[PDB]
Amino acid sequence: GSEEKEEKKVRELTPQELELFKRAMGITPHNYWQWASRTNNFKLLTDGEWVWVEGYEEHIGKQLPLNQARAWSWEFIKNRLKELNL
Numbered sequence: 001g002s003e004e005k006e007e008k009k010v011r012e013l014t015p016q017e018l019e020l021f022k023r024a025m026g027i028t029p030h031n032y033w034q035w036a037s038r039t040n041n042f043k044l045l046t047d048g049e050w051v052w053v054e055g056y057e058e059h060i061g062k063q064l065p066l067n068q069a070r071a072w073s074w075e076f077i078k079n080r081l082k083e084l085n086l
Helices: 019-025 032-038 074-084
Strands: 051-053
16 A cells, blocks of 8 residues: 555556547548557557557657657547547
């Protein structure tokens, strides 16, 4: 027990929660496997903040294109999700 001196853990990666990500991006069965690759099995960590792909937090803050991009904001996620909402 160290309720302030033990864990700094982030939000976990369940098959239920992760669906919201690919949902917001509008990912299609055509580029599904393509996104599944870049997203490392749609495994992205976050905590009420910008989201990143597990294992690519080492690739954050670098000059990478959208193809090499491995992080997005909650604002961007909602940006596309709001476009999906009609």
